[PDB]
Amino acid sequence: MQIFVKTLTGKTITLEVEPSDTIENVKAKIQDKEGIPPDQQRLIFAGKQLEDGRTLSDYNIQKESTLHLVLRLRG
Amino acid sequence: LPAPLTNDPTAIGPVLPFEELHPRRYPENTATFLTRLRSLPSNHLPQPTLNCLLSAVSDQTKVSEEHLWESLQTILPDSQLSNEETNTLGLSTEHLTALAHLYNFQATVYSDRGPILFGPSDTIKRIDITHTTGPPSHFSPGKRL
Ligand SMILES: *NC[C@H](*)CC(=O)OC
């Protein structure tokens, strides 16, 4: 399948992942596409901040379903 | 996977997002970080050693770091204000969103990846923060080019 990710800078990335793909590997692919480490990544699917230790199928995310990305900048 | 704020003694209620507990006109999804409603009064926590964010906010809002830290103690549980992350990596932008809600402003963070907004849009004050990837993230006032 294929989904989309809307970032905090307005850019909507197009990503290709498996239905059983873990959120950690999704953040790794986002790091590949952009360069944002998983340290500053928090993914949201309709208001609910996703957990790293889960998969896309658990949140019932179909193909072409957009996920929001929020940066958790430390410092 | 386990969370310290789940059984935090300085907070009451269950785990809810910050936007549900204190709703405003935050930037889209920038307030979805989970927290809990503060129960006990200010424990008088010490000023965090990694206090770059507090200095950056103080240079813009003219509010002393002490008052900002006390307001953070009144809004947030202790387990999310001074923990292993606070003393190693430092403060997060979630504290910046909490301070923006408490003091009514929309901070503009000029990070290495571009400009981001944090805090309610239904405000007047607009502060500017410069974010450095470093390592690690360094917080300063103003913007850069
Ligand atoms: N991230 C904590 C603040 C950084 C700092 O204090 O640098 C001087």
Side-chain angles (χ1 to χ4, degrees), chain B residues 48-107:
Chain B
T49 53
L50 309 176
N51 50 74
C52 51
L53 177 70
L54 293 172
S55 301
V57 175
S58 177
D59 187 78
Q60 297 281 318
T61 61
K62 311 304 170 182
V63 187
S64 59
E65 298 174 42
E66 300 165 296
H67 294 133
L68 305 163
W69 187 244
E70 292 285 305
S71 301
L72 286 166
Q73 290 186 59
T74 60
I75 192 88
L76 280 165
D78 292 339
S79 61
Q80 299 185 273
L81 298 168
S82 219
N83 58 343
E84 204 156 329
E85 182 179 307
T86 304
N87 291 265
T88 55
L89 296 122
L91 299 143
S92 279
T93 51
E94 301 156 327
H95 308 102
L96 183 66
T97 309
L99 284 173
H101 153 74
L102 285 170
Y103 289 77
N104 312 318
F105 61 87
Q106 189 171 70

Side-chain angles (χ1 to χ4, degrees), chain A residues 35-36 68 70 72-75, chain B residues 85 90-91 93 113 137 139:
Chain A
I36 309 168
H68 292 88
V70 168
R72 186 176 178 257
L73 300 177
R74 306 182 208 259
Chain B
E85 182 179 307
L91 299 143
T93 51
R113 274 160 209 279
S137 163
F139 284 90

Side-chain angles (χ1 to χ4, degrees), chain A:
Chain A
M1 68 169 186
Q2 195 183 266
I3 53 99
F4 307 93
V5 171
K6 189 168 284 181
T7 62
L8 264 184
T9 33
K11 182 180 178 181
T12 315
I13 332 167
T14 309
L15 283 161
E16 205 172 343
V17 290
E18 282 192 314
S20 56
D21 222 308
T22 60
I23 297 296
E24 296 180 340
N25 200 12
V26 175
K27 292 180 181 187
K29 295 178 179 184
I30 296 166
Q31 184 185 6
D32 302 331
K33 275 272 193 174
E34 294 304 298
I36 309 168
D39 266 285
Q40 329 177 300
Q41 291 187 61
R42 295 291 181 269
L43 292 163
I44 293 93
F45 175 68
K48 292 184 179 176
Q49 190 165 97
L50 309 172
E51 177 63 79
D52 297 22
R54 284 274 149 262
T55 57
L56 292 132
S57 60
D58 303 331
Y59 303 98
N60 198 238
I61 305 170
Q62 299 135 75
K63 57 188 185 176
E64 300 151 300
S65 300
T66 312
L67 309 170
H68 292 88
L69 177 59
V70 168
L71 307 173
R72 186 176 178 257
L73 300 177
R74 306 182 208 259

